[PDB]
């Protein structure tokens, strides 16, 4: 195990005046080496996604992006007020391949069903990572990587209810958020497909907790970026209520909603809470033009309640998130420098 400053790789377009392409062109390289990954037969290697120094470096890179990219109108940080120009700019995350310099190497776990922590009896040697988009969101991981086999749930400690459960889906669920043109938005999720998706998540949770009843609930409360599904779509911050998504009971039925497809009440806020460090930030009014963005729910961030005393009758899970590091561990769990 070692730690060195890694570089990155992207198909960034210099001619594109969008923040991700501009930054990547100025701080990355098209690459790549060919053709495959050097497989290591009969070699076991231990991994630890919940302590990978790769995520920390990436986290600082994602932050450094927003700093020179989205310029807020007002910035409140530790009793400090900062006002500045806030021009609107195209904002679309671009896949980034973090590569290792000369001298070191990157071990990749080929095991399709890998929890992220433990022995891996099928590793390899890669020069750089795969396509990883800087998706900043909460509750629902967007535009990530699907599982090659079954859905996989991960947690630094399933026992500790204060920990996050990084869920990976094997089948992507499409979500359509559009602002018609008032300044209000709404999202669309196939009720049929999303159902079975919850089913799959349930049988996995029920499996990890020997024998209990799985029941989803809305957010227990907190900040608007935690209570609702917060995400960036076209340089705008959306806050969509997902009380309809996480409201089902598993253990023989309970509550089924219909109406063909699910529609979530959403809205755009100018005053948001910074995800980088502690503080707030106000931005410019919504764009007069229309905003269409269709994303892909390939992952979920859930938090378990449970615990207390006197046996168990049922478990409860809620849409979690917040720490964007969890969003990177869903893509960098099978890598090791």
């Amino acid at each position: 195990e070692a730690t060195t400053t890694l570089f990155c790789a992207s198909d960034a377009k210099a001619y594109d005046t969008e923040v991700h392409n501009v930054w990547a062109t100025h701080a990355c390289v098209p690459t790549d080496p060919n053709p495959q990954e050097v497989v290591l037969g009969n070699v076991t290697e231990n991994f630890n996604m919940w302590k990978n120094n790769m995520v920390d470096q990436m986290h600082e890179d994602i932050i450094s992006l927003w700093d020179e990219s989205l310029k807020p109108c007002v910035k409140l940080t530790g009793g400090s007020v900062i006002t500045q120009a806030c021009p609107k700019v195209s904002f679309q995350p671009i896949p980034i391949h973090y590569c290792v310099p000369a001298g070191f190497a990157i071990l990749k776990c080929n095991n399709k069903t890998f929890n992220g922590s433990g022995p891996c009896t099928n590793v390899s040697t890669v020069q750089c990572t795969h396509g990883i988009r800087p998706v900043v969101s909460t509750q629902l991981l967007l535009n990530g990587s699907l599982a090659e086999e079954d859905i996989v749930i991960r947690s630094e400690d399933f026992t500790d209810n204060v920990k996050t459960i990084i869920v990976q889906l094997n089948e992507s669920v499409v979500i359509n958020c559009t602002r018609p043109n008032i300044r209000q938005a709404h999202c669309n999720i196939s009720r049929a497909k999303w159902n079975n998706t919850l089913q799959q998540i349930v049988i996995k949770l029920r499996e990890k907790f020997r024998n209990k009843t799985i029941a989803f609930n809305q957010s227990s409360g907190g900040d608007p970026e935690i209570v609702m599904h917060s995400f960036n779509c076209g340089g705008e911050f959306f806050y969509c209520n997902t009380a309809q998504l996480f409201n089902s009971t598993w253990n023989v039925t309970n509550g089924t909603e219909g109406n063909d497809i699910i529609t979530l009440q959403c809205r755009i806020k100018q005053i948001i809470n910074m995800w980088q460090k502690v503080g707030k930030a106000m931005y410019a009014p919504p764009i007069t033009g229309q905003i269409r963005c269709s994303s892909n729910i390939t992952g979920l961030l859930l938090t378990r309640d449970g615990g207390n005393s006197t046996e168990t009758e049922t478990e409860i899970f809620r849409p979690g998130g917040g720490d964007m590091r969890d969003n990177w561990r869903s893509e960098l769990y099978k890598y090791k420098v």
Partner: antibody
Framework: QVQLQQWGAGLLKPSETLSLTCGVY????????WSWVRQPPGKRLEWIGE???????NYHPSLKSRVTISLDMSKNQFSLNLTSVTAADTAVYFC?????????????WGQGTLVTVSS | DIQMTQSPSFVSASVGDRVTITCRAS??????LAWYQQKPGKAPKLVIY???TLQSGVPSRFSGSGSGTEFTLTISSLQPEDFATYYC????????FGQGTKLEIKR
């Protein structure tokens, strides 16, 4: 060893099109990029763009709407388009190979082709 | 956009003398720089890349250093063939070069 040769019309007129071709001898186009770099008379060099064997080009911001780089994988050669040329396009265009990270420097280079646009 | 300015633009040094040309950047670029040697009616020749990494074949008298904004290309002992025009390049971003430094003989 590898040598990059360049051929094409040097003397051009306004509104016309620049079409230069750089041939590769001693190496295949595979596993390597191929970029064009011009240099105005008595000025710094300027990276125009580079194309990959996959077909995805990477042009310069102010030259995207005119520059078009392709690949002739059958003859191991690549070309450089430039629609609607003007007097400001008068320069010596070069062609160089760009390897993969960490190796990025342009190498080898071509002998260059002097281009002049006049009416 | 990052600007690359070299200094001086015109160096006068006799053969065998020690010469040192600099290249300042408007913004931080770490170690994404290269140097090239170009003679009249000829194409540039890669001298030193990665700011301080010498190209295969390049004489030992050629050396480079610096990181961030300030950079340096030093030649221990000059030779009749060393006299030419040197350019500095931002290996990434817009791949912009410098106005170049023309090294000539002194009399």
């Amino acid at each position: 060893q590898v040598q990059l040769q360049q051929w094409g019309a040097g003397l051009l007129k306004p509104s016309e099109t620049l079409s230069l071709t750089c041939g590769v001898y001693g190496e295949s186009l595979s596993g390597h990029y191929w970029s064009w770099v011009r240099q105005p008379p008595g000025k710094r060099l300027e990276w125009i763009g580079e194309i990959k064997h996959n077909g995805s080009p990477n042009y310069h911001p102010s030259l995207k709407s005119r520059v078009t780089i392709s690949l002739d994988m059958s003859k191991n050669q690549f070309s450089l388009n430039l629609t609607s040329v003007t007097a400001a396009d008068t320069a010596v265009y070069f062609c160089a190979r760009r390897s993969n990270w960490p190796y990025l420097p342009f190498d080898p280079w071509g002998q260059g082709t002097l281009v002049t646009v006049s009416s | 956009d990052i600007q690359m300015t070299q200094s001086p633009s015109f160096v006068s040094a006799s053969v065998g003398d020690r010469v040192t040309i600099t290249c300042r950047a408007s913004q931080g670029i770490s170690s994404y720089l290269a140097w090239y040697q170009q003679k009249p009616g000829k194409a540039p020749k890669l001298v030193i890349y990665a700011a301080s990494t010498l190209q295969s074949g390049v004489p030992s008298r050629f050396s480079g250093s610096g990181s961030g904004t300030e950079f340096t290309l030093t030649i221990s002992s000059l030779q009749p063939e060393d006299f030419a025009t040197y350019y500095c390049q931002h290996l990434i971003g817009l791949r912009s070069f410098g106005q170049g430094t023309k090294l000539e003989i002194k009399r």
